[PDB]
Design a protein around this ligand. Structure first.
Ligand code: NAG
Ligand code: NAG
Ligand code: NAG
Ligand code: CA
Ligand code: CA
Ligand code: CA
Ligand code: CA
Ligand code: CL
Ligand code: MG
Ligand code: MG
Lengths: 583, 453
């Protein structure tokens, strides 16, 4: 009973939709509110001022797209103050198919400051008709067997794609460039051995910038057989760094893969030099091969990846449907991955690259599980930092997976599985990590099951504590009975310390208990208190309110009067409460 | 056998103090310096103090019970705090009512061969219902999923033909369509269900829970009688529920209301899928018992729903739905051989447990719900209901149902904190004063001066 309900403030723009308040986030003197659009409206973000009492829509600067999904995903980094916003409603058509993935925005300073953006888990459109050009290195470094293996690679790719809508062209490049055959030359023959039998190894330098500009302006020409309705794809094959410099702006509309082969790409620094030539993300389009014989192993990856889909990889990934930031590291969930098995994307700091981590192994039982619906960092200092992600639909019951950060030179590994027991309960539909004693080790993982049904209580929140072997279930946060569909657990947040005892406290939203309610659970010695110290009825703050407790955020607030400020979302409303020593 | 006493100055406060406290009513039982609080103690302690056995006031919780399937219909209880009263409810399973069977079918593309078989089963279904009881009716509805991405491909060509491209008689995807109001005319089923085309969608879980909710929320359009209500749910994989709509940016919860327009659930993209518990609640209210007819690989998943929807059954549907009539007969037997005895919401001043004495050879005791399996027609089973109050309660009531049936037991709860002592007759001349004599202690009419008036 440290939250001053009598002093509550409320915020609502005049044109606010029903889902203004779907997410709330407190940054100095303001609240950021995610407002996903309903019906035909598009979503938006609102910056709400503590002083003026007004909420204003945020103009995304240099953004090309805004769907109704904008506002669904707001996260902030406690270590550096970064804000990540995501719009997981980027839809596009590729022949008769529709793709759906996310667009994410990183505000390093504040919403008015510089913005970075990216498309995590983005699948480029590869149509039925593809105009593909091979641009192969002929530099003086290639021995004749190595140059030949490059020739044979292009042949097997053409051979495996012979009865498709693909049309091919080939350009050798060294100091200068020669078209070894145009698209028309491929249509009139379709014989790879014949098309390339006049190829003579140039034995000079490696002018990659000029080569790419040459391909974009002198090869993709309609009078040479290029189809303007086809996807333009470029496969670059090189064994050394570029000997020129400039830009490839003339080729930016081309989907560009690049393959670095051999001893000259031993260092990660040299491999990095190929990134400016290829499309993003470099994890998809930049292939480093240590030996020339591995050009055969690459045949599947660079061609099976290259219309009626009944089975989907990342085309319907729904990336950015959740996010979390810790210590400068951002991750977003992608529930659609691998036919809605799910997973998460480990983002590069500039949002220009990503790494997908998902279920392992892909078994038929992970399908339609929606892993990555929730993602929550569990940082530690002495122990390894973990990431928890819920698959609330796993086998219609849900589960939570614990992933360990890459340790040393290693990779992400999955270290624990936590099973839900009740069908439809959405076990893992909400997650929250808590470091109660603030020793730098996050020991508590809270798992919401907001749809849990039975015993006259709607929804559950379970407490898991980290032991040596893994997380063990130690307690439950008890909500009031009498609301069997009340969705206790839909929102869980750590409030920092609200009652000045040095221990972190937790809030739990229960948005469908009458007009909504928020429970406050105080931190104690050795964990969390299972009984709440306060319950805040929405009806008390506003009379016509609904969904009170749909989202909660707490922070030690630096301006104003009080120990902590707590923001609570509701239907078309956002409410701010101050924590006080004596209420 | 234990009594803790704090405030006792009357017989009624003694009983209120606990279930083990008793009150002596002997006249002139108290010494000059003693209070009449010594008059309230445990039975052995009172006997220690010279009170005779017949002068010991020791109330006991009592139940007053007043051819039916559920007997008795009305019971009045008298509860002293801390002591339970017990009464037996008898369930004698009668003969079945007429059966309304609404057949709700998945029409995504893998159900194409199932659709061709179901189009010809209208006769067999009515004949099956009339082999069970009398005067059956059948209805029909269909579902695929919500019509937003990524549940369906919203490309205009794939909306017109969600089915694979070869398919030539295919309807756009849809959430729920009410095809046939409950009727006893099988030819109506044939021509109405025959008009339906196969459809398709994008992701494996389907939106059948949307359709079930609309069926349970629209009783006038569906045509339910007040007889046995069966809802066959025929599908061949999983189902969406609340929270999944987020992928389509559908964040408003299901409101559990009827939304049929032109026999379609048009606003399905305005509301999220219902939660399982939300649907279980709606099905219990309206007495609608679902029969999940699912393929073999889904059976273990759908069986977990019977955990949460008490009156439901699961049967293994064939890949072409050709066994569905025997599936429904088996499911009826399983549904009606199971009997739950439950009560509505209670004040927490009361607690109710059930003993279930079953005829199949099983006995449960002290359970929040009565549960017997293997119940047979005209073979009675007995439920012992025990009700305990923690305090002197205000007059109240609560109903006891048999799940799936409308018969109720109305339990009137009355407090018994009053002592029921004796007549002051033979003792008049009373307290040497005006006051009257209750329970061996004089409560003098307000004032004069004195405990002894
Ligand atoms: C948005 O589109 C414009 C084209 O008008 C382009 O110049 C810009 O690079 C695009 N933004 C991003 C982030 O790619
Ligand atoms: C109810 O019946 C059971 C078994 O037939 C019996 O043991 C019990 O005494 C009965 N209860 C009452 C209150 O008569
Ligand atoms: C069928 O239901 C109708 C109501 O539409 C009723 O009139 C009729 O008696 C019932 N039985 C038969 C055999 O039609
Ligand atoms: Ca800690
Ligand atoms: Ca605290
Ligand atoms: Ca089939
Ligand atoms: Ca579906
Ligand atoms: Cl070279
Ligand atoms: Mg070279
Ligand atoms: Mg299907």
């Amino acid at each position: 009973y440290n939250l001053d309900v009598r002093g509550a403030r409320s915020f609502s723009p005049p044109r606010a939709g029903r889902h203004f308040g779907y997410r709330v986030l407190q940054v100095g003197n303001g609240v950021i509110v995610g407002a996903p659009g309903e019906g035909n409206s598009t979503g938006s973000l609102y910056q709400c001022q503590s002083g003026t009492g007004h909420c204003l829509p945020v103009t995304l600067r240099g953004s090309n797209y805004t769907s109704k999904y904008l506002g669904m995903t707001l996260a902030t980094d406690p270590t550096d103050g970064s804000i990540l916003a995501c719009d997981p409603g980027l839809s596009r058509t590729c022949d008769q198919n529709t793709y759906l993935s996310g667009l994410c925005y990183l505000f390093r300073q504040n919403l008015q400051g510089p913005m970075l953006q990216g498309r995590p888990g983005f699948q480029e459109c590869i149509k039925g008709n593809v105009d593909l050009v091979f641009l192969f290195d002929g530099s003086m470094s290639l021995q004749p067997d190595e140059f030949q293996k490059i020739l044979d690679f292009m042949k097997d790719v053409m051979k495996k794609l012979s009865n498709t809508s693909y049309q091919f062209a080939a350009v050798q490049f060294s100091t200068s460039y020669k078209t070894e055959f145009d698209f028309s030359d491929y249509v009139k023959w379709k014989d790879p051995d014949a098309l390339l039998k006049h190829v003579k190894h140039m034995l000079l330098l490696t002018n990659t910038f000029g080569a790419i500009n040459y391909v974009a302006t002198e090869v993709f020409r309609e009078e040479l057989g290029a189809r303007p309705d086809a996807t333009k794809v470029l496969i670059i094959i090189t064994d050394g760094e570029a000997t020129d410099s400039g830009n490839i702006d003339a080729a930016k509309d081309i989907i560009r893969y690049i393959i670095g082969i051999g001893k000259h790409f031993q260092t990660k620094e040299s491999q990095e030099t190929l990134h400016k030539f290829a499309s993003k993300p470099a994890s998809e389009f930049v292939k480093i091969l240590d030996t020339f014989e591995k050009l055969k192993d690459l045949f599947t990856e660079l061609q099976k990846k290259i219309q009626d889909l009944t089975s989907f990889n990342m085309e319907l990934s729904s990336s950015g449907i959740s996010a979390d930031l810790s210590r400068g590291h951002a991750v977003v969930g992608a529930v659609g991955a691998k036919d809605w098995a799910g997973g998460f994307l480990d983002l590069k700091a500039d949002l220009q690259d990503d790494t997908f981590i998902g279920n392992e192994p892909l078994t038929p039982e992970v399908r339609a599980g929606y892993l990555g619906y929730t993602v929550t960092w569990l940082p530690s200092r002495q122990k390894t930092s973990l990431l928890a992600s819920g698959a609330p639909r796993y086998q219609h019951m849900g589960r939570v997976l614990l992933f360990q950060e890459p340790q040393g030179g290693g990779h992400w590994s999955q270290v624990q599985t936590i099973h839900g027991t009740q069908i439809g309960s959405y076990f893992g539909g909400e997650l929250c990590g808590v470091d109660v004693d603030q020793d730098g080790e996050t020991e508590l993982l809270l798992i919401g099951a907001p749809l849990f049904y039975g015993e006259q209580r709607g929804g559950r929140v379970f407490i898991y504590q980290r032991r040596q072997l893994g997380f063990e279930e130690v307690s439950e946060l008890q909500g009031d009975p009498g609301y069997p569909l009340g969705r206790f657990g839909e929102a869980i947040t750590a409030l920092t310390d609200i009652n000045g005892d040095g221990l972190v406290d937790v809030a739990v939203g229960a948005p469908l208990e009458e007009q909504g309610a928020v429970y406050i659970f105080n931190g104690r010695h050795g964990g969390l208190s299972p009984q709440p110290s306060q319950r805040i009825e929405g009806t008390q703050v506003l009379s016509g309110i609904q969904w009170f407790g749909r989202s909660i955020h707490g922070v030690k607030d630096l301006e104003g009067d009080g120990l902590a400020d707590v923001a609570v979302g509701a239907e078309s409303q956002m409410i701010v409460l101050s924590s006080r020593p004596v209420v | 056998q234990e009594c803790t006493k704090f405030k006792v100055s009357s017989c009624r406060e003694c009983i209120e103090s606990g279930p083990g406290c008793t009150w002596c009513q002997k006249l002139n039982f108290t010494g000059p310096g003693d209070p009449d609080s010594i008059r309230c103690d445990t039975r052995p302690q009172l006997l220690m103090r010279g009170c005779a056995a017949d002068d010991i006031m020791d109330p006991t919780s009592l139940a007053e019970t007043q051819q039916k399937q559920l007997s008795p219909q009305k019971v009045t209880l008298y509860l002293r705090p801390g002591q339970a009263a017990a009464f037996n409810v008898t369930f004698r399973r009668a003969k079945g009512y007429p059966i309304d069977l609404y057949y709700l079918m998945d029409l995504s593309y893998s159900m194409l061969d199932d659709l061709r078989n179901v189009k010809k089963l209208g006769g067999d279904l009515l004949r099956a219902l009339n082999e069970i009881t009398e005067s059956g009716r059948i209805g029909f509805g269909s579902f695929v999923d919500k019509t937003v991405l990524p549940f369906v491909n919203t490309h205009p060509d794939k909306l017109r033909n969600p089915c694979p491209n070869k398919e030539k008689e295919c309807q756009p995807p849809f959430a729920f369509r009410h095809v046939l109001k409950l009727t006893n005319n099988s030819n109506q089923f044939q021509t109405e269900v025959g008009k339906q085309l196969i459809s398709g969608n994008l992701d494996a879980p389907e939106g059948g829970l949307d359709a079930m909710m609309q069926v349970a929320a629209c009783p006038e359009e569906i045509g339910w009688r007040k007889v046995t209500r069966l809802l066959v749910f025929a599908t061949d994989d999983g189902f969406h529920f609340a929270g999944d709509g987020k992928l389509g940016a559908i964040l408003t919860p299901n409101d559990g209301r009827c939304h049929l327009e032109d026999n379609l659930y048009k606003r399905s993209n305005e509301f999220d899928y219902p939660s399982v518990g939300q649907l279980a609640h709606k099905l219990a209210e309206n007495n609608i018992q679902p029969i999940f007819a699912v393929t073999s690989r889904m059976v273990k998943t759908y069986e977990k729903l019977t955990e949460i929807i008490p009156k439901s059954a699961v049967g293994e549907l064939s890949e072409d739905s050709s066994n569905v009539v025997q599936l429904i007969k088996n499911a009826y037997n399983k549904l009606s051989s199971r009997v739950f005895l439950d009560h509505n919401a209670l004040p927490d001043t009361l607690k109710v447990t059930y003993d279930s004495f079953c005829s199949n050879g099983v006995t449960h005791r002290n359970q929040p719900r009565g549960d017997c399996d293997g119940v047979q027609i005209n073979v009675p089973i007995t439920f012992q209901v025990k009700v305990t109050a923690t305090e002197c309660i205000q007059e109240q009531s609560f109903v006891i149902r048999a799940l799936g049936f409308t018969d109720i037991v109305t339990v009137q709860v009355l407090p018994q904190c009053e002592c029921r002592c004796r007549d002051q007759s033979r003792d008049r001349s009373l307290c040497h004063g005006k006051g009257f004599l209750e329970c061996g202690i004089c409560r003098c009419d307000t004032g004069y001066i004195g405990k002894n008036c």
